Write a protein that binds this ligand. Structure first.
Ligand code: MG
Ligand code: MG
Ligand code: MG
Ligand code: MG
Ligand code: MG
Ligand code: MG
Ligand code: MG
Ligand code: MG
Ligand code: MG
Ligand code: MG
Lengths: 150, 83, 207, 84, 190, 129
RNA sequence: GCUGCAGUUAAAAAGCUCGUAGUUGGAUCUUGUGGAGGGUUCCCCGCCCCUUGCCUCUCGGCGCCGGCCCGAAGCGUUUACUUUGAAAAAAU
């Protein structure tokens, strides 16, 4: 099931077995490169690029018209942010919860949920570190953690 | 069931369910021995020969002797597909 | 049966449509699901009649394979069946049981009604549960007229039909008595039988 | 269930009632379609479960809407399934 | 050319040179010059099939093959009118690096990209045979003696563009690898 | 969370033979399972079987006859040394006239009556009888 | 009780969740014939790209009529596993 909830649902997605390019699609393996670059200059994370390209244009799977997954693209042009987006998205949640905690110190359910968020953060760091992705001296400390989000 | 001479050494040889292939021990008073007539295919009349079927007890008491006999009949000239 | 001389003729189709045997109930089983064609737009199922015919000729072939005709015991407890089974005992030499069944008729060597058949035709497997669960003690095959909602347990050749109490019960028994006599060779095929189905229908309040 | 169902050749109409993960090969329930608004005339192609407010590259203020499932169109004309 | 157009292949080759001169002389006259671009091939091979016939095979160099596919149905129709009775299939000449753990010397040389394995090539070559159509599923029957048939499903559109070519495909593939394939068509696409 | 894939495959085949089915679907699958089912088929305990591609781990459909009685896995793949093989086929097997121990050796996945023939031991996978 | 026990009611599952050591971890990266021992394919040699994987030598023996051919030296990325050898006092 989940890792911190009890529920256990299957709501994933399911790719087509036919990996071929969609026969009718106009866009070609170089135009999407520039579309991705332009979309990234506005400041969109990889997932947001993916959903924009999936709705507004016909490219269902960036990885199939191109050869690469859309993060190695932002990497091989010096555009990926310094730290991955999941860790940023979790640290942003933790700093959101800590403010509410200090404003009303009786929200014990917020205390429990904050404990859970910080543990997920540690579990994700510990893995990014042994992948040569973060400085092995990396750390998550509240007051440092706020400035981290920028 | 033979030995180093060949001659069989066995009280008897039980018969197996035709739908489950599990031998039918001699205290199973639910196994049945259905016996279905042939016809002569030109006049539509019974003529000597017939085809025999064995059905175990357990598959009979789980409600599956029906479809079993049906498939065993379709497997021969008794229904010839197109059901 | 696969050939032509055994295929359903268009007058039997009209008897079936007149008695309403194709009309089923509102419920279903997971075992009678291959006999249904579809479900009507008000909540009732429809019985495929070619499957009815194939199962009918299979039961006919099961009765014809019994040498002495007198051990093909024919049971029916509900009213709508009684008159039918009595005519069946007249048509072919079988042995009727119409009324209450008196448990232990097959498995008691002391009772005065102890009879040891070799086959068992029975209407309505749900209202005759007792003869079925007693056939489960003496290696006794079974034949039965089920419905859209009839539990299949200890039955072997299920002839789907209305049998909810109708002209359909009588029609089914009459047609089964025709086909046993035909393929045993006691009456000739495609000369219509002198008997009339209404000899097998029930007494609704008379006059 | 008859105790003898054959699984290598399922029903072409039952194979489409089971969840997308639970059928012999996985297959999405989504599709792509060519919407065509009245007025300004361009053939912009949209995902079904769009979850973005798309626009016509011209004279429209909106072209479809996000919902819990499939996007609902305003007045889009053709929206043919693109079938590749 | 017709002799220098089979590099790394022991250039003097009779039938490959003949087919080379034929195909590049169709590249010579400007009738079909805007979609053929004087591009090289690398080998060719004609062999029997199981229906008392014969068919020919063209080995393309790999990075060209996406451009050959852009024209392949018109170009093969042109070659078959020029080669009545025979069939032309385009496959790239893929390299296979033996399994380093212990099949050749391991020397910390390089990683053996997973694209250069055995099975990656053995399934890409299978998709090159069927080109006008598309693979839509696979299956394998393990027969009662350990033997294997590969069941391949091909797309339902493009039928008459491959329908008569199913039985040459089995021969050429049994030739290239050794596996006994059979091709069918799916009743419904869901 | 699915640590042992052979354990599921053999338990899945086994929970269905007792019920009386005629075909079973196994998911995921592997080279190991496919090799094991081949050993179970060369001897006649199951019928032929068909593997489904789906661009992930695949699925297998197996045709069962009634001849099978049990199959199972020994969960830690212990080592066996051809002098401790008898102490295994005397604890796991029902009689010295039928049944097979299946083990993986440097010469492939085989059954003990062949490991004795080629003079090698290895790691125990399971048994079927 | 490792083979091999038990934990609803007989003796017994921490009130509840998080968490480092410990224990456990999904799928995936090479196959057919000509001879040999054993049959009617399949299981010491080399062949579809590979087959002890190569190299390049040098000093010393094995060949032919100097010139050319093949055994040795490097080891193949490392382990666990399995099999064989060596080496292990007598008495019991
Ligand atoms: Mg789950
Ligand atoms: Mg969530
Ligand atoms: Mg946990
Ligand atoms: Mg979700
Ligand atoms: Mg997910
Ligand atoms: Mg005790
Ligand atoms: Mg008490
Ligand atoms: Mg207690
Ligand atoms: Mg508790
Ligand atoms: Mg693993």
């Amino acid at each position: 099931g989940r890792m911190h909830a009890p529920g256990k649902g299957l709501s994933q997605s399911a790719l087509p077995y036919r990996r071929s390019v969609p026969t009718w699609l106009k866009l070609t393996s170089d135009d999407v490169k520039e579309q991705i670059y332009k979309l990234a200059k506005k400041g969109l994370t990889p997932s947001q690029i993916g959903v924009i390209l999936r709705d507004s244009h016909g490219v269902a799977q960036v990885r199939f018209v191109t050869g690469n997954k859309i993060l190695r693209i932002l990497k091989s042009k010096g555009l990926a942010p310094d730290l991955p987006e999941d860790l940023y998205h979790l640290i942003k949640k933790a700093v959101a919860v800590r403010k509410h905690l200090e404003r009303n110190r009786k929200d014990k359910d917020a205390k429990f949920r904050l404990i859970l968020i910080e543990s997920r953060i540690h579990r994700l760091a510990r893995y990014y570190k042994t992948k040569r992705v973060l400085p092995p001296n990396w750390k998550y400390e509240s007051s440092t953690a706020s400035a981290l989000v920028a | 069931m033979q030995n180093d001479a060949g001659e069989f050494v066995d009280l008897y040889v039980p018969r197996k369910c035709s739908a489950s292939n599990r031998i039918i021990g001699a205290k199973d008073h639910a196994s049945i021995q259905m016996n279905v007539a042939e016809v002569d295919k030109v006049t539509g009349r019974f003529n000597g020969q017939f085809k025999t079927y064995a059905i175990c007890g357990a598959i009979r008491r789980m409600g599956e002797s029906d479809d079993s006999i049906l498939r065993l009949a379709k497997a021969d000239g008794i229904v010839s597909k197109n059901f | 049966g696969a050939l032509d001389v055994l295929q359903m003729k268009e007058e039997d189709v009209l008897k079936f449509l007149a008695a309403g045997t194709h009309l089923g109930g509102t419920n279903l089983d997971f075992q009678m699901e291959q006999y249904i064609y579809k479900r009507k737009s008000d909540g009732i199922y429809i019985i495929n009649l070619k499957r009815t015919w194939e199962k009918l000729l299979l039961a006919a072939r099961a009765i014809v394979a019994i040498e002495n005709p007198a051990d093909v015991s024919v049971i029916s407890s509900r009213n709508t069946g009684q008159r039918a089974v009595l005519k069946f005992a007249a048509a072919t030499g079988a042995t009727p049981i119409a009324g209450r069944f008196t448990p232990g008729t097959f498995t008691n060597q002391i009772q005065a009604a102890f009879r040891e058949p070799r086959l068992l035709v029975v209407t309505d497997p749900r209202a005759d549960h007792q003869p079925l669960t007693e056939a489960s003690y003496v290696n006794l095959p079974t034949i039965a007229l089920c419905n859209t909602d009839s539990p299949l347990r200890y039955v072997d050749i299920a002839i789907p039909c209305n049998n909810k109490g109708a002209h359909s019960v009588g029609l089914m028994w009459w047609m089964l008595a025709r086909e046993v006599l035909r393929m045993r060779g006691t009456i000739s095929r495609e000369h219509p039988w002198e008997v009339m189905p209404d000899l097998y229908f029930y007494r609704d309040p008379e006059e | 269930m008859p105790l003898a169902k054959d699984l290598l050749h399922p029903s072409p109409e039952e194979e489409k009632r089971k969840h997308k993960k639970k059928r012999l090969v996985q297959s999405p329930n989504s599709y792509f379609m060519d919407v065509k608004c009245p007025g300004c005339y361009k053939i912009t192609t949209v995902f079904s479960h769009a979850q973005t407010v798309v626009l016509c590259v011209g004279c429209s203020t909106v072209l479809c809407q996000p919902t819990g499932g499939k996007a609902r169109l305003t007045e889009g004309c053709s929206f043919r399934r693109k079938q590749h | 050319s017709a002799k220098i157009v089979k590099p790394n292949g022991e250039k003097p080759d009779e039938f490959e040179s003949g087919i080379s001169q034929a195909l590049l002389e169709l590249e010579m006259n400007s009738d079909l010059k805007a979609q053929l671009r004087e591009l090289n091939i690398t080998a060719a091979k004609e062999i029997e099939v199981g229906g008392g016939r014969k068919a020919i095979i063209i080995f393309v160099p790999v990075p060209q093959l996406k451009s050959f596919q852009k024209i392949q149905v018109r170009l093969v129709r042109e070659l078959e009118k020029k080669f009545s009775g025979k069939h032309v299939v385009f496959i790239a000449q893929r390299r296979i690096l033996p399994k380093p753990t212990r099949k050749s010397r391991t020397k910390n040389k390089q990683k053996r990209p997973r694209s250069r394995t055995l099975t990656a090539v053995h399934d890409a070559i299978l998709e090159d045979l069927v080109f006008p159509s598309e693979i839509v599923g696979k299956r394998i029957r393990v027969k009662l003696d350990g033997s294997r048939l590969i069941k391949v499903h091909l797309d339902k559109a493009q039928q008459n563009n491959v329908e008569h070519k199913v039985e040459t495909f089995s021969g050429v593939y049994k030739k290239l690898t050794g596996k006994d394939v059979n091709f069918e068509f799916p009743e419904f696409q869901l | 969370v699915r640590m042992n894939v052979l354990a599921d495959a053999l338990k899945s085949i086994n929970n269905a033979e007792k019920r009386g089915k005629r075909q079973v679907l196994i998911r995921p699958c592997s080279k190991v399972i496919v090799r094991f089912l081949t050993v179970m088929m060369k001897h006649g305990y199951i019928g032929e079987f068909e593997i489904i591609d789906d661009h992930r781990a695949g699925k297998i459909v197996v045709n069962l006859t009634g001849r099978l009685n049990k199959c199972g896995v020994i969960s830690p793949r212990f080592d066996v040394q051809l002098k401790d093989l008898e102490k295994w086929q005397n604890n796991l097997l029902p009689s010295r006239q039928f049944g097979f121990i299946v083990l993986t050796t440097s010469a492939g996945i085989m059954d003990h009556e062949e490991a004795r023939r080629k003079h090698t031991g290895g790691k125990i996978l399971g048994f079927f009888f």
